[PDB]
């Protein structure tokens, strides 16, 4: 019967879906198993980068007084199924929309989301094939494009995902002030008692030549970008494993709900067909009538 096989075809599709999704889990687990190494070897490259850029400033004075392009470089994944990382990043970007906002997102999902969402502000995006390891050259490519998008930019921000643990992926921010504002703050940290922790660091840079300072600024900016993309990848694989498990269980619940309707349908189909036949049998029996019995009734 077609109706019964309709369920069977429907359950047939869900079976292949489970296999393919399970294959996805195998791929991500391998990438996560090899990307788990960074957890050991992180949290030490960015030590003097903190001094260069770590400034816990207010969230209003920073954006209110923007007289030049504020460039944002959100990190987004090429492929979907990651989870809520991209959605949260969009919420974090929507919360900071302004006249001077320029967007140079990373990843196809960021491009697709922001090209539709912010066509005019979006200038162009960067795309990396997840074939090699996240290296310095990729970060240098992010920065160079960011400068060319807006060289006279008040700040360049990177909004990425920090992988705290297997189940915790928060949103983190690297704000990078352009040369002019950085060297001005570096000049105040040197002379003034304010910013004590940066006093020695700043004076040790002012002693050197300028080109060295410019190289120092670019180099540490690249490192911050490199950390963000590296973390955003590790958060991506960890999130996909969590999401893929959810899809597997959702596709298992459907397999248990379409199987019951298929086993309930076959039972009803057998009963109805048999009932029809017996109804016809009883109709042809009822229409039949016994005739007069032509026997020797007296002979008894």
């Amino acid at each position: 019967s077609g109706k019964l096989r309709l369920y069977k075809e429907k359950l047939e599709g869900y079976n292949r879906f489970y296999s393919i999704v399970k294959t996805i889990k195998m791929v991500t687990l391998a990438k996560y198993r090899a990307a788990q190494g960074r957890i050991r070897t992180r949290d030490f490259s960015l030590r003097y980068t903190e001094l260069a850029f770590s400034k816990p400033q207010a969230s209003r004075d920073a954006v209110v007084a923007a007289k030049n392009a504020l460039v944002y470089i959100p990190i987004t994944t090429n492929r979907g199924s990651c989870g809520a990382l991209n959605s949260n990043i969009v919420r974090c970007i929507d919360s900071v929309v302004s006249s001077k906002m320029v967007l140079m997102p990373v990843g196809k999902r960021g491009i697709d989301s922001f090209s539709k969402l912010y066509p005019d502000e979006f200038r162009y995006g960067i795309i990396n094939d997840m074939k090699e390891s996240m290296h310095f050259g990729y970060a240098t490519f992010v920065i160079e494009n960011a400068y060319e998008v807006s060289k006279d930019a008040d700040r360049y921000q990177v909004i990425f995902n920090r992988f705290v643990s297997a189940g915790v992926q928060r949103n983190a921010v690297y704000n990078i002030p352009s040369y002019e504002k950085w060297k001005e703050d570096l000049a105040d940290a040197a002379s003034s008692d304010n910013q004590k922790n940066r006093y020695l660091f700043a004076n040790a840079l002012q002693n050197e030549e300028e080109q060295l300072i410019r190289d120092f600024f670019d180099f540490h900016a690249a490192l911050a970008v490199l950390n963000a993309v590296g973390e955003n990848e590790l958060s991506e694989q960890a999130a996909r494993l969590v999401a893929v498990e959810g899809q597997l269980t959702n596709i298992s619940s459907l397999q248990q709900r379409t199987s019951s309707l298929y086993n309930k349908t076959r039972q009803f189909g057998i009963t109805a067909a048999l009932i029809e036949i017996l109804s016809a049998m009883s109709s042809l029996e009822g229409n039949a009538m016994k005739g007069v019995r032509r026997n020797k009734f007296w002979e008894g």
Binding site: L29, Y32, R33, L241
Partner: protein, 123 residues
């Protein structure tokens, strides 16, 4: 009551062993906690200890059969769950009946290992 408590404890341990088995797939046993690495060792012993050689197969399999008493089984599992037999090798529980058989197999395994090591030192 002792029988019921032991049986429920065994079931709980086996169920936990399944989840731990799946956790290590994504992590590796070295990651698991030492409670969950003692619980993954006892569970494996339990799985091996629930096998048994039947006397009906004394002919076609060659191994003497066993008929484990009810009380003996309860005591053996109760001791294993507590951790008394945490030094016995895992394979000593494979295809054996009772706890005494486990001890005898462990001793034979230890004796065989010692003889092999002694022979190796000679050459």
């Amino acid at each position: 009551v002792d029988h019921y408590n032991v049986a429920q404890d065994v079931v709980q341990m086996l169920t936990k062993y399944r989840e731990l088995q799946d956790i290590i797939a994504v992590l590796g046993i070295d990651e698991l906690s030492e409670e969950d690495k003692l619980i993954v060792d006892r569970a494996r012993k339990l799985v091996k200890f629930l096998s048994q050689p039947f006397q009906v197969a004394e002919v076609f399999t060659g191994m003497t059969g066993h008929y484990v008493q009810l009380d003996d089984t309860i005591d053996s599992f109760s001791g294993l769950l507590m951790g008394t037999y945490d030094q016995v090798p895992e394979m000593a529980f494979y295809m054996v009946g009772g706890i005494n058989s486990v001890l005898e197999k462990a001793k034979k395994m230890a004796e065989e290992a010692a003889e092999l090591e002694k022979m190796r030192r000679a050459r």
